[PDB]
Amino acid sequence: MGHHHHHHSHMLPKESVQILRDWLYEHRYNAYPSEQEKALLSQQTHLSTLQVCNWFINARRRLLPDMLRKDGKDPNQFTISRRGAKISE
């Protein structure tokens, strides 16, 4: 009873992004890696801890830079933009 599946990155639903983004936006400072944040977001969202944790690392690494540069109250920790995003055609 094998299960057909494919390995490829994908973005989470808009509803999950809004709730996940709202938490990060409200807690941009203490956005640093933490089990309490990952566990709290995991219970709030219908995604697994691994999905939220991996998404948090990527989303945070692409969201903090924009908010930190836009504000400028504490710019640090990987200031990279939205992870490349220089492709366009």
Side-chain angles (χ1 to χ4, degrees):
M1 296 296 293
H3 297 285
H4 63 283
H5 57 265
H6 296 287
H7 292 85
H8 175 70
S9 175
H10 53 78
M11 291 177 65
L12 325 183
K14 292 180 178 63
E15 183 177 10
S16 59
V17 171
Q18 188 68 42
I19 293 170
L20 290 166
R21 184 179 66 185
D22 287 345
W23 178 258
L24 180 61
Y25 179 81
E26 291 175 0
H27 293 96
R28 288 177 291 176
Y29 311 115
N30 58 304
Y32 282 72
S34 43
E35 183 177 346
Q36 292 69 41
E37 281 57 286
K38 290 180 175 63
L40 183 141
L41 292 173
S42 165
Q43 295 295 309
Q44 186 183 44
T45 46
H46 66 284
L47 302 178
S48 49
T49 311
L50 279 291
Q51 289 176 295
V52 174
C53 172
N54 281 262
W55 177 94
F56 187 71
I57 293 168
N58 193 37
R60 183 180 63 85
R61 184 174 294 166
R62 295 180 294 174
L63 289 169
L64 231 72
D66 180 60
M67 295 292 183
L68 288 166
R69 289 172 64 189
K70 185 176 181 293
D71 289 347
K73 186 177 181 180
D74 52 277
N76 57 7
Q77 184 177 4
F78 292 95
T79 62
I80 185 168
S81 191
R82 290 179 180 272
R83 186 182 297 277
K86 304 295 198 79
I87 290 63
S88 178
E89 61 183 323

